[PDB]
RNA sequence: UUAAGUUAUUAAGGGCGCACGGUGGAUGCCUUGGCACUAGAAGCCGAUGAAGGACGUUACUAACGACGAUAUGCUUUGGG
């Protein structure tokens, strides 16, 4: 997904982080009430959030060198 | 039959020999860990926050290892 992410503009990435965090919140609420049954999604969403943050930090590092 | 005489039999328990069990962890065989050295690098980090820690992180989580709210891991260049 790292190559797909690099196509997004910097404002799309923020919106995507904001949606993945909400999606992860809902899964943790479902797990606690005992009705989830698909526990493999929690790790997937966490890894996507980590990738988005990595690509976002890359651009901010890179532009400061050019500036 | 009566006298006189001699010598037998018991094992409550014990002793010795033998057979068969239990307890215990010596002996033999073994090695995951150690000990003494040789050759070649190197030796000491820190206010750009150290050495050493505390708390946390896995779907289910007590301890040790790994990691730090990007947490039982993220990106990239090579190998396979």
Automatic annotation (TrEMBL):
GO terms for molecular function: structural constituent of ribosome. InterPro entries: Ribosomal_protein_uL29, Ribosomal_uL29, Ribosomal_uL29_sf. It comes from the Bacteria. This is Large ribosomal subunit protein uL29. Gene3D superfamilies: 1.10.287.310. It comes from Staphylococcus schweitzeri. GO terms for cellular component: cytosolic large ribosomal subunit. SUPFAM superfamilies: Ribosomal protein L29 (L29p). Belongs to the universal ribosomal protein uL29 family. The keyword tRNA-binding does not apply. GO terms for biological process: translation. Keywords: Ribonucleoprotein, Ribosomal protein. PANTHER family: 60S RIBOSOMAL PROTEIN L35/50S RIBOSOMAL PROTEIN L29, LARGE RIBOSOMAL SUBUNIT PROTEIN UL29C.
């Amino acid at each position: 997904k790292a190559k797909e992410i690099r196509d997004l503009t910097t404002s799309e990435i923020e919106e995507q982080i904001k949606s993945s965090k909400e999606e992860l919140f809902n899964l943790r609420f479902q797990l606690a009430t005992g009705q989830l049954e698909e526990t493999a999604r929690i790790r997937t969403v966490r890894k996507t959030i980590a990738r988005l943050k990595t690509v976002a930090r890359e651009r901010e590092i890179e532009q400061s060198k050019a500036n």
